[PDB]
Write a protein that binds this ligand. Structure first.
Ligand code: AGS
Ligand code: MG
Length: 331
């Protein structure tokens, strides 16, 4: 085999290379983090690949507190990874690290963003393993997550919400054309620029190749029902994110108590959660993104077009970055 020979050359070392190298190696991490465990020797293994010259391995090694280190205060944490500020001790370059255990690592997280070039998808700088400790390096975005932004603001003005959905739908489309599902699209998983003008998709831990969902409130009915699933799952999730941005709360939550699987399958789509004060086009785009049958549901491309035109309808991006708190919809 050609790939299994290529992979062996990469193992035990951290190297400068390209996307396919990291991708192929990550597969072995995912398979490795499943064994019945072994007594650790004196040699804790150090391997991975670095995708940019801004992060340099010295003598085929790249270890924490030796070649690089984290900064004050964590940037955030989800259900699987802790993210910190990072500095390479030689280059002096600043970026982000996501810390993931080997036992929960999926190779699809790197397969989904390695080498890919889109302003709407966070650049991946590489990933290195220190035994059972996986470190995922990526571009640092200083504006925090959309989830942080919505928690602080309460909810977003119509134009702001549309503006970010549009950007997220541009990232979703880029992925779907490369036959990759996101899996966990929500406000926590979209990063923002310092000035708030740029949004980028992050967190591909629930990614899956085309031909497990991330968040219950954002699950499409066809996932819940155990039916067949395609890229349309991300577009449903993105409209659940949209309602979260408009209302300041996740869908379903202010109406039902968990588990919500039954409700998502049994109830009509949560189109009643669209604020009545929204523009006709805004409400229309959400309604067709929240179509229960994925076949009759619009693609990321079709939805992106509809939200751009809806943004034009409300008069473009006019609302200020940050600004006044808007009281979330009352339960
Ligand atoms: N590059 C980054 N710059 C700034 N903040 C980040 C960055 N990456 C992640 N964060 C923040 O840290 C949080 C956790 O990172 P995620 O990548 O979402 O990990 P996770 O939620 O455990 O992934 P899952 O659950 O496997 S889908 C995010 O919600 C962001 O708020
Ligand atoms: Mg996350």
């Amino acid at each position: 085999s050609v790939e299994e020979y290529l992979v062996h050359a990469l193992q035990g070392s951290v190297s400068s290379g390209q996307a396919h190298s990291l991708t192929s190696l990550a597969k072995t991490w995912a398979a490795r983090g499943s064994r019945s465990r072994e007594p650790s020797p004196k040699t804790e293994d150090n391997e991975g690949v670095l995708l940019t010259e801004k992060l340099k391995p010295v003598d085929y090694e790249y270890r924490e507190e030796v070649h690089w280190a984290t900064h004050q205060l964590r940037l955030g944490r989800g259900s699987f990874g802790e993210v910190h500020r990072m500095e390479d001790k030689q280059t002096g370059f600043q970026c982000a690290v996501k810390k993931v255990r080997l036992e929960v690592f999926r190779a699809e997280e790197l397969m989904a963003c390695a080498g890919l070039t889109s302003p709407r998808i966070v650049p991946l700088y590489g990933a290195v393993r220190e035994g059972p400790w996986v470190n995922i390096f990526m571009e640092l975005l200083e504006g925090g997550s959309l989830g942080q932004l919505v928690k602080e603001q309460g909810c977003l003005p119509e134009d702001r919400a549309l503006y970010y959905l549009g950007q997220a739908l541009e990232g979703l489309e880029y992925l779907h054309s490369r036959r990759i599902l996101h899996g966990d699209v929500k406000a926590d998983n979209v990063l923002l620029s310092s000035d708030g003008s740029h949004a980028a998709l992050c967190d591909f831990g629930h990614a899956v190749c085309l031909q497990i969902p991330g968040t219950e409130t954002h699950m499409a009915p066809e996932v819940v029902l155990g039916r067949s699933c395609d890229a349309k799952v991300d577009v449903w999730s993105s409209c659940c994110m949209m309602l979260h941005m408009l209302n300041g709360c996740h869908p379903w939550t202010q109406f039902f108590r968990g588990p919500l699987c039954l409700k998502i399958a049994s109830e009509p789509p949560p189109v009643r959660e669209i604020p009545p004060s929204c523009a006709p086009l805004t409400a229309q785009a959400i309604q067709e993104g929240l179509r229960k049958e994925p076949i009759h549901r619009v693609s990321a491309a079709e939805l992106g077009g509809k939200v751009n035109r809806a943004l034009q309808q409300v008069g473009g991006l006019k609302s200020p970055w940050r600004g006044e708190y808007k009281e979330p919809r009352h339960p």
